[PDB]
Design an enzyme around this catalytic site. Sequence first.
Site, PDB file in Angstrom:
ATOM      1  N   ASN B  79      -8.355 -83.664   0.539  1.00 55.26           N
ATOM      2  CA  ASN B  79      -9.805 -83.039   0.619  1.00 55.26           C
ATOM      3  C   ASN B  79      -9.605 -81.457  -0.373  1.00 55.26           C
ATOM      4  OD1 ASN B  79     -10.728 -84.814   2.526  1.00 55.26           O
ATOM      5  ND2 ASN B  79      -9.232 -83.900   3.926  1.00 55.26           N
ATOM      6  N   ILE B  86     -11.753 -76.500  -1.681  1.00 53.35           N
ATOM      7  CA  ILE B  86     -11.794 -77.335  -0.458  1.00 53.35           C
ATOM      8  C   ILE B  86     -13.081 -78.083  -0.089  1.00 53.35           C
ATOM      9  CG2 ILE B  86     -11.501 -77.277   2.103  1.00 53.35           C
ATOM     10  CD1 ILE B  86     -10.161 -74.442   1.540  1.00 53.35           C
ATOM     11  N   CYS B  87     -13.110 -79.220   0.431  1.00 57.56           N
ATOM     12  CA  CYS B  87     -14.277 -80.124   0.550  1.00 57.56           C
ATOM     13  C   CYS B  87     -14.529 -80.210   2.075  1.00 57.56           C
ATOM     14  CB  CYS B  87     -13.977 -81.205   0.139  1.00 57.56           C
ATOM     15  SG  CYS B  87     -15.451 -82.407  -0.169  1.00 57.56           S
ATOM     16  N   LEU B  88     -15.016 -78.865   2.653  1.00 60.99           N
ATOM     17  CA  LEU B  88     -15.309 -78.590   4.021  1.00 60.99           C
ATOM     18  C   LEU B  88     -17.103 -78.762   4.019  1.00 60.99           C
ATOM     19  CD1 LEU B  88     -13.783 -76.207   6.290  1.00 60.99           C
ATOM     20  CD2 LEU B  88     -15.530 -77.751   7.187  1.00 60.99           C
ATOM     21  N   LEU B 121     -16.782 -87.495  -2.184  1.00 62.79           N
ATOM     22  CA  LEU B 121     -16.246 -86.901  -3.645  1.00 62.79           C
ATOM     23  C   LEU B 121     -15.196 -87.915  -3.823  1.00 62.79           C
ATOM     24  CD1 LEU B 121     -17.681 -84.296  -4.827  1.00 62.79           C
ATOM     25  CD2 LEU B 121     -17.514 -84.372  -2.230  1.00 62.79           C
TER      26      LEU B 121
END
Lengths: 192, 152
Positions: B79, B86-88, B121
């Site tokens: 992530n 960051i992929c939040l 992603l």
Amino acid sequence: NVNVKKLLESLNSKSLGDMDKDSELAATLQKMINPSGGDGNASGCALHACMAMLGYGVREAPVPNEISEYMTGFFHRHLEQIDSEGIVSHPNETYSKFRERIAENILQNTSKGSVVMISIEQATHWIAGFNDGEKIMFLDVQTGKGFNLYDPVEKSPDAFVDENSSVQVIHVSDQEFDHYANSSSWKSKRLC
Amino acid sequence: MAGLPRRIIKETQRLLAEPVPGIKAEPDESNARYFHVVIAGPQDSPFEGGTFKLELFLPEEYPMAAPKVRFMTKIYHPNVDKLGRICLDILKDKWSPALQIRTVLLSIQALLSAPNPDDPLANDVAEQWKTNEAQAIETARAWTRLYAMNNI
């Protein structure tokens, strides 16, 4: 399924105090509105406390990635009532001395069984206010405590309030309450 | 020049005094909007024993603008990309002025203890994580020893 103000008496008249019956009810509701919680969904949990005390029922409150569903709008709107410096604790003022003093811009500007959204430190945190008639009941329901100022552990009746501690009470329209009961965000929240 | 005062003050005072367990932070000398946060790699996680650096930037209209957070320390995570991005969700689309910094910090630290699959992603690490989980761990563990330790 002890829903509605059914157990509103089951958790009110006993040998329990005023600042004491608070953390009482909240701890119950917490178990339904925030099954194991403690993140940032404060705003949502509080809007739901008002919802239950207004009759609509108890529904799992929205979780962080669902806050924007409705809460971002509520903020959108009530922002001016939040960017207010509101009530501010005086030096040396205790937790009870501040909870009582705050239960005025409430008891005064209140109703029969009305509720309110209480902002802590301008959206830093939230708690729900309920007017039973003579007194006021503050419910956190997110961590299931009574009136507090975003404290991990519920503070003692006579602890000192940090300096400049401020709370802005948020007067919430009944229309706003009806608007949210007619929103998809609300209807999608798990009931009970 | 006119915003939501009490909240930024109170949220900062909390971050540098009353912070989340396993998260410490020191504000940047130059800009007072940037925070040098440090998160401890959790136990029973591949990052156990590592102290990762994160950059926390509070934009112009912070409450109404999702804050910007990124890993300044490298890390093998499905992530977090090579740049530290960051992929939040609550940092992307799902951000609300109703959420505080603690929400994001908590979320990130949670992500370390248990990475997320539901991630649109494209990422090689991610790919290795969901297929060759075994090796993927081994590798994160080694990167925690290289980048996340003795890194101060």
